[PDB]
Amino acid sequence: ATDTGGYAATAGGNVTGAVSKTATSMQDIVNIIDAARLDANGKKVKGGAYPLVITYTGNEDSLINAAAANICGQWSKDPRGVEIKEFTKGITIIGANGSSANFGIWIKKSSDVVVQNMRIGYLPGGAKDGDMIRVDDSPNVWVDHNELFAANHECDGTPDNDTTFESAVDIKGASNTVTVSYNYIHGVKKVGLDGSSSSDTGRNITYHHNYYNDVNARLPLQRGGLVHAYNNLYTNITGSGLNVRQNGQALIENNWFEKAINPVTSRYDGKNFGTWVLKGNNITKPADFSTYSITWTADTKPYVNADSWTSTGTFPTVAYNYSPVSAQCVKDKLPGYAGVGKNLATLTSTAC
Ligand SMILES: [Ca+2]
């Protein structure tokens, strides 16, 4: 099936003629994809020669544990990552239970890519774009059931005082349809962009069933386009949550917000505010702000906060089929479905 519960519709490498491969290291993933570009005669095929389902069984806990003990030594190191460039045959990278990576997955000008069950953390090279996951000019990408983490902290003297660590899931360019679901994102200062600049507007992205904990900002920092955020559990947000900018439209439904500062806002530009349609969240009126520890702050430039907790715009009819559970059920059940080792389980009303 190509159903992701969001805008992206892809089966990834799970199609007719898929070749299954086992990668035991980063370098293996690199060599495997490289071989997947060759035809029966050894000549390269544009977009790839055949579909792939790579099961990553490597484990880099040692690297992860060492970086966690000295987080400020990470930013200056060389970034580590596997690039999936111009591969359109369909590819799925799935981590085996127990696998871990201290390298990122960078998708560029590709399509039909699924990344599942990967535990990625404390990547080196924050000053050199060391993203855990990057989706650039790539439509139909599904980032599901991964655990993306680092430390929600900024060391002194880093370039732009913002490069201790890079992002969890940055999306830019023509990544027209993307679904980011069931991820356990924790300890990340900059979660993810949805547009790299004021000019990089557009895309239809869906963030669902994600569990965010101890994150500073960008859930996402949206620039234009559409964002459908449903059934996410947002806790301990130390900066701001969904920042809807450049006239972007957001549909925020059935999420659970708690201990969050500026959970829904439009700031930093001073103009062209985005809009949001709020519905079914645990917060229903300003009165709930104290109940769930929601705080608001101003910005030096003109801004708009959802402090009245009312819809400020409209949202087109959601194309795909999806069935959200109640915000309370996400608060109760989600932690057990989000992340790695959950066998890619999904939260249904039956389980509520
Ligand atoms: Ca980045």
GROMACS .gro file of N, CA and C in nm, residues 166-308:
model
  429
  166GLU      N    1   2.277   1.999   1.445
  166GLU     CA    2   2.190   2.040   1.338
  166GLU      C    3   2.050   1.982   1.362
  167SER      N    4   1.970   1.975   1.257
  167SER     CA    5   1.831   1.931   1.270
  167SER      C    6   1.794   1.785   1.269
  168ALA      N    7   1.675   1.756   1.319
  168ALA     CA    8   1.624   1.620   1.322
  168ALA      C    9   1.569   1.582   1.184
  169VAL      N   10   1.478   1.662   1.129
  169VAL     CA   11   1.421   1.636   0.996
  169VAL      C   12   1.401   1.766   0.919
  170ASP      N   13   1.503   1.809   0.846
  170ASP     CA   14   1.495   1.931   0.766
  170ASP      C   15   1.437   1.899   0.630
  171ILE      N   16   1.339   1.977   0.587
  171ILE     CA   17   1.276   1.957   0.457
  171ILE      C   18   1.287   2.087   0.375
  172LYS      N   19   1.335   2.078   0.252
  172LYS     CA   20   1.347   2.197   0.170
  172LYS      C   21   1.335   2.166   0.023
  173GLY      N   22   1.327   2.271  -0.057
  173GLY     CA   23   1.315   2.255  -0.200
  173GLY      C   24   1.183   2.193  -0.242
  174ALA      N   25   1.182   2.129  -0.358
  174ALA     CA   26   1.062   2.068  -0.409
  174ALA      C   27   1.023   1.935  -0.344
  175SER      N   28   1.032   1.925  -0.212
  175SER     CA   29   0.992   1.803  -0.142
  175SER      C   30   0.842   1.821  -0.122
  176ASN      N   31   0.772   1.820  -0.234
  176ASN     CA   32   0.629   1.845  -0.239
  176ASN      C   33   0.534   1.769  -0.151
  177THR      N   34   0.560   1.641  -0.128
  177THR     CA   35   0.474   1.565  -0.040
  177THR      C   36   0.559   1.482   0.053
  178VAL      N   37   0.545   1.505   0.182
  178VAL     CA   38   0.623   1.433   0.281
  178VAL      C   39   0.538   1.399   0.404
  179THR      N   40   0.562   1.283   0.464
  179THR     CA   41   0.491   1.241   0.584
  179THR      C   42   0.598   1.209   0.688
  180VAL      N   43   0.584   1.268   0.806
  180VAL     CA   44   0.677   1.246   0.915
  180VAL      C   45   0.586   1.193   1.023
  181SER      N   46   0.595   1.062   1.047
  181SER     CA   47   0.507   0.998   1.144
  181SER      C   48   0.573   0.902   1.243
  182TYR      N   49   0.511   0.892   1.361
  182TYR     CA   50   0.555   0.803   1.469
  182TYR      C   51   0.699   0.813   1.514
  183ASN      N   52   0.755   0.932   1.510
  183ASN     CA   53   0.893   0.947   1.551
  183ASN      C   54   0.902   0.994   1.694
  184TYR      N   55   1.008   0.953   1.762
  184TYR     CA   56   1.032   0.996   1.899
  184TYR      C   57   1.150   1.092   1.883
  185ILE      N   58   1.119   1.220   1.885
  185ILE     CA   59   1.220   1.322   1.867
  185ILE      C   60   1.244   1.384   2.003
  186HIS      N   61   1.364   1.370   2.057
  186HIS     CA   62   1.390   1.427   2.189
  186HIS      C   63   1.527   1.485   2.204
  187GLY      N   64   1.537   1.593   2.280
  187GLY     CA   65   1.666   1.656   2.302
  187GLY      C   66   1.721   1.720   2.176
  188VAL      N   67   1.635   1.790   2.102
  188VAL     CA   68   1.678   1.853   1.979
  188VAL      C   69   1.645   2.000   1.986
  189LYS      N   70   1.745   2.084   1.966
  189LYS     CA   71   1.720   2.226   1.970
  189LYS      C   72   1.643   2.271   1.846
  190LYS      N   73   1.690   2.233   1.728
  190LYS     CA   74   1.624   2.270   1.602
  190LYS      C   75   1.569   2.146   1.538
  191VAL      N   76   1.440   2.122   1.554
  191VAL     CA   77   1.378   2.001   1.501
  191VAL      C   78   1.377   1.990   1.350
  192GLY      N   79   1.320   2.089   1.282
  192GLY     CA   80   1.318   2.081   1.138
  192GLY      C   81   1.253   2.196   1.064
  193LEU      N   82   1.313   2.229   0.951
  193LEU     CA   83   1.267   2.334   0.863
  193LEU      C   84   1.165   2.275   0.769
  194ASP      N   85   1.080   2.362   0.717
  194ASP     CA   86   0.981   2.326   0.615
  194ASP      C   87   0.995   2.448   0.524
  195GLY      N   88   1.105   2.449   0.449
  195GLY     CA   89   1.136   2.561   0.362
  195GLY      C   90   1.266   2.614   0.417
  196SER      N   91   1.365   2.635   0.332
  196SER     CA   92   1.495   2.682   0.378
  196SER      C   93   1.510   2.832   0.383
  197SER      N   94   1.420   2.904   0.316
  197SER     CA   95   1.424   3.051   0.316
  197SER      C   96   1.288   3.110   0.285
  198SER      N   97   1.282   3.243   0.282
  198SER     CA   98   1.159   3.317   0.255
  198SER      C   99   1.107   3.287   0.116
  199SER      N  100   1.200   3.253   0.028
  199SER     CA  101   1.168   3.222  -0.111
  199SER      C  102   1.134   3.075  -0.132
  200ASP      N  103   1.182   2.989  -0.043
  200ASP     CA  104   1.157   2.845  -0.053
  200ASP      C  105   1.025   2.806   0.012
  201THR      N  106   0.916   2.856  -0.046
  201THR     CA  107   0.782   2.830   0.006
  201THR      C  108   0.707   2.717  -0.067
  202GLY      N  109   0.615   2.652   0.002
  202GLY     CA  110   0.538   2.547  -0.063
  202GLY      C  111   0.539   2.415   0.010
  203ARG      N  112   0.508   2.309  -0.064
  203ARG     CA  113   0.505   2.172  -0.014
  203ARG      C  114   0.385   2.142   0.074
  204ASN      N  115   0.345   2.015   0.075
  204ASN     CA  116   0.233   1.970   0.156
  204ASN      C  117   0.291   1.864   0.245
  205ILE      N  118   0.299   1.893   0.374
  205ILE     CA  119   0.360   1.802   0.468
  205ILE      C  120   0.266   1.765   0.579
  206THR      N  121   0.277   1.640   0.626
  206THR     CA  122   0.195   1.589   0.734
  206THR      C  123   0.283   1.539   0.848
  207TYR      N  124   0.261   1.590   0.968
  207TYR     CA  125   0.335   1.544   1.085
  207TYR      C  126   0.232   1.476   1.173
  208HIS      N  127   0.239   1.344   1.188
  208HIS     CA  128   0.141   1.277   1.272
  208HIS      C  129   0.196   1.170   1.363
  209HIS      N  130   0.135   1.161   1.480
  209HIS     CA  131   0.176   1.062   1.579
  209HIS      C  132   0.322   1.073   1.622
  210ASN      N  133   0.376   1.194   1.618
  210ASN     CA  134   0.512   1.214   1.662
  210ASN      C  135   0.511   1.248   1.809
  211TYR      N  136   0.615   1.205   1.879
  211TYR     CA  137   0.627   1.232   2.019
  211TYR      C  138   0.748   1.321   2.033
  212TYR      N  139   0.724   1.448   2.066
  212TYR     CA  140   0.830   1.546   2.086
  212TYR      C  141   0.850   1.569   2.235
  213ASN      N  142   0.974   1.565   2.282
  213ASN     CA  143   1.001   1.590   2.422
  213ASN      C  144   1.135   1.659   2.440
  214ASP      N  145   1.134   1.774   2.506
  214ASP     CA  146   1.255   1.852   2.530
  214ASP      C  147   1.317   1.899   2.398
  215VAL      N  148   1.241   1.981   2.328
  215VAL     CA  149   1.285   2.034   2.202
  215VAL      C  150   1.270   2.184   2.212
  216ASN      N  151   1.356   2.259   2.145
  216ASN     CA  152   1.346   2.402   2.154
  216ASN      C  153   1.254   2.467   2.052
  217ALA      N  154   1.275   2.440   1.923
  217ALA     CA  155   1.192   2.504   1.821
  217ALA      C  156   1.182   2.431   1.687
  218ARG      N  157   1.101   2.489   1.599
  218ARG     CA  158   1.076   2.440   1.463
  218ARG      C  159   1.003   2.306   1.453
  219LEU      N  160   0.874   2.306   1.486
  219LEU     CA  161   0.794   2.183   1.483
  219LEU      C  162   0.678   2.184   1.382
  220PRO      N  163   0.701   2.230   1.258
  220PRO     CA  164   0.824   2.283   1.198
  220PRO      C  165   0.824   2.435   1.185
  221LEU      N  166   0.934   2.489   1.133
  221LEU     CA  167   0.943   2.630   1.101
  221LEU      C  168   0.893   2.618   0.957
  222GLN      N  169   0.766   2.649   0.937
  222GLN     CA  170   0.701   2.637   0.808
  222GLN      C  171   0.704   2.762   0.723
  223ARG      N  172   0.733   2.744   0.595
  223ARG     CA  173   0.734   2.857   0.504
  223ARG      C  174   0.643   2.832   0.387
  224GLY      N  175   0.524   2.888   0.397
  224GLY     CA  176   0.424   2.872   0.293
  224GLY      C  177   0.369   2.731   0.292
  225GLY      N  178   0.296   2.697   0.187
  225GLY     CA  179   0.242   2.563   0.174
  225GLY      C  180   0.143   2.520   0.280
  226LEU      N  181   0.121   2.389   0.289
  226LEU     CA  182   0.030   2.331   0.387
  226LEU      C  183   0.098   2.236   0.484
  227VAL      N  184   0.054   2.239   0.608
  227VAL     CA  185   0.106   2.148   0.708
  227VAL      C  186  -0.014   2.096   0.783
  228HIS      N  187  -0.027   1.965   0.790
  228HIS     CA  188  -0.135   1.900   0.864
  228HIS      C  189  -0.067   1.832   0.983
  229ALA      N  190  -0.092   1.879   1.104
  229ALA     CA  191  -0.031   1.818   1.221
  229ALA      C  192  -0.140   1.758   1.307
  230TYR      N  193  -0.148   1.626   1.310
  230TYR     CA  194  -0.248   1.560   1.391
  230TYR      C  195  -0.193   1.447   1.478
  231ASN      N  196  -0.254   1.430   1.594
  231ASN     CA  197  -0.216   1.326   1.689
  231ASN      C  198  -0.071   1.326   1.741
  232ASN      N  199  -0.008   1.443   1.747
  232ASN     CA  200   0.128   1.452   1.797
  232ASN      C  201   0.123   1.485   1.945
  233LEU      N  202   0.223   1.441   2.019
  233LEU     CA  203   0.230   1.469   2.162
  233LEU      C  204   0.347   1.565   2.176
  234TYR      N  205   0.316   1.690   2.207
  234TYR     CA  206   0.417   1.795   2.223
  234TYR      C  207   0.438   1.827   2.370
  235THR      N  208   0.553   1.789   2.426
  235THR     CA  209   0.581   1.818   2.567
  235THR      C  210   0.720   1.877   2.585
  236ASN      N  211   0.730   1.970   2.678
  236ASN     CA  212   0.856   2.036   2.708
  236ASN      C  213   0.918   2.103   2.586
  237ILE      N  214   0.847   2.202   2.532
  237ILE     CA  215   0.894   2.280   2.420
  237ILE      C  216   0.951   2.407   2.486
  238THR      N  217   1.080   2.429   2.470
  238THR     CA  218   1.144   2.541   2.534
  238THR      C  219   1.158   2.671   2.456
  239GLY      N  220   1.116   2.673   2.330
  239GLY     CA  221   1.127   2.795   2.251
  239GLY      C  222   0.996   2.833   2.184
  240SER      N  223   0.953   2.753   2.088
  240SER     CA  224   0.830   2.775   2.016
  240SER      C  225   0.798   2.645   1.943
  241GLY      N  226   0.672   2.627   1.904
  241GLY     CA  227   0.633   2.503   1.838
  241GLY      C  228   0.620   2.522   1.689
  242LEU      N  229   0.496   2.512   1.642
  242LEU     CA  230   0.470   2.531   1.501
  242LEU      C  231   0.480   2.679   1.472
  243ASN      N  232   0.577   2.716   1.391
  243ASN     CA  233   0.595   2.855   1.354
  243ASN      C  234   0.548   2.866   1.208
  244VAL      N  235   0.424   2.910   1.188
  244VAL     CA  236   0.363   2.923   1.054
  244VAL      C  237   0.393   3.057   0.990
  245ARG      N  238   0.483   3.056   0.892
  245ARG     CA  239   0.525   3.178   0.825
  245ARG      C  240   0.500   3.182   0.675
  246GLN      N  241   0.529   3.297   0.616
  246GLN     CA  242   0.513   3.320   0.473
  246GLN      C  243   0.380   3.273   0.419
  247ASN      N  244   0.274   3.312   0.489
  247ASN     CA  245   0.138   3.278   0.449
  247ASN      C  246   0.110   3.130   0.439
  248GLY      N  247   0.177   3.051   0.521
  248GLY     CA  248   0.150   2.908   0.520
  248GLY      C  249   0.018   2.882   0.591
  249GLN      N  250  -0.044   2.769   0.560
  249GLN     CA  251  -0.169   2.732   0.625
  249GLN      C  252  -0.144   2.605   0.703
  250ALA      N  253  -0.192   2.601   0.826
  250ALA     CA  254  -0.173   2.483   0.906
  250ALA      C  255  -0.305   2.435   0.963
  251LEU      N  256  -0.323   2.303   0.969
  251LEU     CA  257  -0.441   2.241   1.029
  251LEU      C  258  -0.385   2.165   1.150
  252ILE      N  259  -0.413   2.216   1.269
  252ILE     CA  260  -0.363   2.157   1.393
  252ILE      C  261  -0.474   2.085   1.469
  253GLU      N  262  -0.480   1.953   1.454
  253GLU     CA  263  -0.587   1.880   1.517
  253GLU      C  264  -0.558   1.758   1.602
  254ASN      N  265  -0.628   1.752   1.715
  254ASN     CA  266  -0.618   1.640   1.807
  254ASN      C  267  -0.479   1.611   1.858
  255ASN      N  268  -0.407   1.717   1.890
  255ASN     CA  269  -0.272   1.704   1.943
  255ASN      C  270  -0.280   1.728   2.091
  256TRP      N  271  -0.175   1.692   2.162
  256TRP     CA  272  -0.172   1.715   2.305
  256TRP      C  273  -0.052   1.804   2.335
  257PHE      N  274  -0.078   1.926   2.380
  257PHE     CA  275   0.028   2.020   2.414
  257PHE      C  276   0.040   2.026   2.565
  258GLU      N  277   0.163   2.032   2.615
  258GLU     CA  278   0.188   2.039   2.758
  258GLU      C  279   0.328   2.090   2.788
  259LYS      N  280   0.338   2.183   2.883
  259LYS     CA  281   0.464   2.243   2.923
  259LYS      C  282   0.533   2.296   2.798
  260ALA      N  283   0.461   2.379   2.724
  260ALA     CA  284   0.511   2.436   2.600
  260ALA      C  285   0.507   2.588   2.597
  261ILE      N  286   0.613   2.649   2.545
  261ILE     CA  287   0.621   2.795   2.531
  261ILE      C  288   0.595   2.825   2.383
  262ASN      N  289   0.502   2.916   2.355
  262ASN     CA  290   0.464   2.953   2.218
  262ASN      C  291   0.436   2.829   2.129
  263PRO      N  292   0.345   2.740   2.172
  263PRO     CA  293   0.317   2.622   2.090
  263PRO      C  294   0.273   2.645   1.946
  264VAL      N  295   0.203   2.754   1.919
  264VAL     CA  296   0.159   2.785   1.784
  264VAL      C  297   0.178   2.934   1.768
  265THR      N  298   0.260   2.975   1.672
  265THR     CA  299   0.290   3.116   1.655
  265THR      C  300   0.336   3.146   1.513
  266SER      N  301   0.358   3.274   1.484
  266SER     CA  302   0.408   3.319   1.354
  266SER      C  303   0.496   3.436   1.391
  267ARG      N  304   0.626   3.412   1.395
  267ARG     CA  305   0.718   3.516   1.435
  267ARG      C  306   0.848   3.509   1.358
  268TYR      N  307   0.933   3.608   1.385
  268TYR     CA  308   1.066   3.622   1.326
  268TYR      C  309   1.072   3.690   1.191
  269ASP      N  310   0.959   3.709   1.124
  269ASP     CA  311   0.961   3.777   0.995
  269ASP      C  312   0.909   3.920   1.011
  270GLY      N  313   0.805   3.933   1.093
  270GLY     CA  314   0.745   4.062   1.115
  270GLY      C  315   0.638   4.089   1.013
  271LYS      N  316   0.611   3.993   0.925
  271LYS     CA  317   0.507   4.012   0.824
  271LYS      C  318   0.469   3.882   0.756
  272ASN      N  319   0.365   3.888   0.673
  272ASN     CA  320   0.313   3.773   0.600
  272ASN      C  321   0.287   3.656   0.694
  273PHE      N  322   0.205   3.681   0.797
  273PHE     CA  323   0.175   3.578   0.895
  273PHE      C  324   0.098   3.460   0.836
  274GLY      N  325   0.130   3.341   0.885
  274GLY     CA  326   0.061   3.222   0.839
  274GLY      C  327  -0.065   3.209   0.921
  275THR      N  328  -0.148   3.110   0.888
  275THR     CA  329  -0.275   3.088   0.957
  275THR      C  330  -0.283   2.947   1.009
  276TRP      N  331  -0.378   2.924   1.099
  276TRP     CA  332  -0.401   2.792   1.155
  276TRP      C  333  -0.547   2.766   1.186
  277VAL      N  334  -0.587   2.641   1.168
  277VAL     CA  335  -0.722   2.595   1.199
  277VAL      C  336  -0.699   2.501   1.317
  278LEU      N  337  -0.746   2.540   1.436
  278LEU     CA  338  -0.727   2.459   1.555
  278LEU      C  339  -0.851   2.377   1.585
  279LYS      N  340  -0.835   2.249   1.617
  279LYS     CA  341  -0.950   2.166   1.649
  279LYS      C  342  -0.921   2.032   1.715
  280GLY      N  343  -0.993   2.006   1.823
  280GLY     CA  344  -0.978   1.880   1.893
  280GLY      C  345  -0.853   1.859   1.975
  281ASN      N  346  -0.775   1.963   1.998
  281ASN     CA  347  -0.653   1.948   2.078
  281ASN      C  348  -0.692   1.943   2.225
  282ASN      N  349  -0.597   1.915   2.314
  282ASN     CA  350  -0.631   1.912   2.457
  282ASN      C  351  -0.662   2.054   2.504
  283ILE      N  352  -0.607   2.152   2.433
  283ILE     CA  353  -0.631   2.292   2.465
  283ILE      C  354  -0.746   2.336   2.377
  284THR      N  355  -0.852   2.389   2.438
  284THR     CA  356  -0.968   2.435   2.363
  284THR      C  357  -1.000   2.582   2.381
  285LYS      N  358  -0.944   2.643   2.485
  285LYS     CA  359  -0.967   2.784   2.511
  285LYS      C  360  -0.856   2.832   2.602
  286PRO      N  361  -0.828   2.963   2.602
  286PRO     CA  362  -0.723   3.022   2.685
  286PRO      C  363  -0.720   2.975   2.830
  287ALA      N  364  -0.836   2.934   2.882
  287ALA     CA  365  -0.846   2.886   3.019
  287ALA      C  366  -0.760   2.762   3.042
  288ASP      N  367  -0.742   2.681   2.938
  288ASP     CA  368  -0.663   2.560   2.949
  288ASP      C  369  -0.514   2.584   2.954
  289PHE      N  370  -0.470   2.704   2.919
  289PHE     CA  371  -0.328   2.735   2.919
  289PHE      C  372  -0.263   2.706   3.053
  290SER      N  373  -0.327   2.746   3.163
  290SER     CA  374  -0.267   2.722   3.295
  290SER      C  375  -0.271   2.575   3.332
  291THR      N  376  -0.380   2.509   3.294
  291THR     CA  377  -0.398   2.367   3.321
  291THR      C  378  -0.284   2.283   3.262
  292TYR      N  379  -0.238   2.319   3.142
  292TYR     CA  380  -0.133   2.245   3.073
  292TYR      C  381   0.002   2.313   3.062
  293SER      N  382   0.023   2.415   3.144
  293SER     CA  383   0.148   2.490   3.147
  293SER      C  384   0.193   2.547   3.011
  294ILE      N  385   0.104   2.625   2.949
  294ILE     CA  386   0.133   2.689   2.821
  294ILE      C  387   0.167   2.834   2.851
  295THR      N  388   0.282   2.875   2.802
  295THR     CA  389   0.334   3.009   2.821
  295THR      C  390   0.351   3.077   2.686
  296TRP      N  391   0.340   3.210   2.684
  296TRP     CA  392   0.355   3.286   2.561
  296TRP      C  393   0.452   3.400   2.584
  297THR      N  394   0.526   3.437   2.480
  297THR     CA  395   0.619   3.549   2.490
  297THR      C  396   0.602   3.630   2.365
  298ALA      N  397   0.654   3.752   2.367
  298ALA     CA  398   0.646   3.840   2.252
  298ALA      C  399   0.776   3.831   2.175
  299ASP      N  400   0.780   3.893   2.060
  299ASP     CA  401   0.901   3.894   1.983
  299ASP      C  402   0.928   4.040   1.960
  300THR      N  403   1.053   4.073   1.929
  300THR     CA  404   1.090   4.210   1.904
  300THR      C  405   1.024   4.264   1.777
  301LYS      N  406   0.992   4.175   1.683
  301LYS     CA  407   0.927   4.213   1.557
  301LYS      C  408   0.778   4.174   1.560
  302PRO      N  409   0.693   4.239   1.477
  302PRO     CA  410   0.550   4.206   1.475
  302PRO      C  411   0.530   4.055   1.464
  303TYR      N  412   0.438   4.001   1.544
  303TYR     CA  413   0.413   3.858   1.547
  303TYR      C  414   0.268   3.827   1.579
  304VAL      N  415   0.233   3.699   1.571
  304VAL     CA  416   0.099   3.653   1.603
  304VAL      C  417   0.112   3.522   1.678
  305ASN      N  418   0.056   3.518   1.799
  305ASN     CA  419   0.055   3.399   1.885
  305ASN      C  420  -0.087   3.347   1.883
  306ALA      N  421  -0.108   3.219   1.914
  306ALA     CA  422  -0.245   3.166   1.919
  306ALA      C  423  -0.294   3.177   2.062
  307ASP      N  424  -0.264   3.288   2.128
  307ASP     CA  425  -0.305   3.306   2.267
  307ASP      C  426  -0.455   3.319   2.292
  308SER      N  427  -0.532   3.336   2.185
  308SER     CA  428  -0.677   3.344   2.196
  308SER      C  429  -0.729   3.205   2.164
   0.00000   0.00000   0.00000
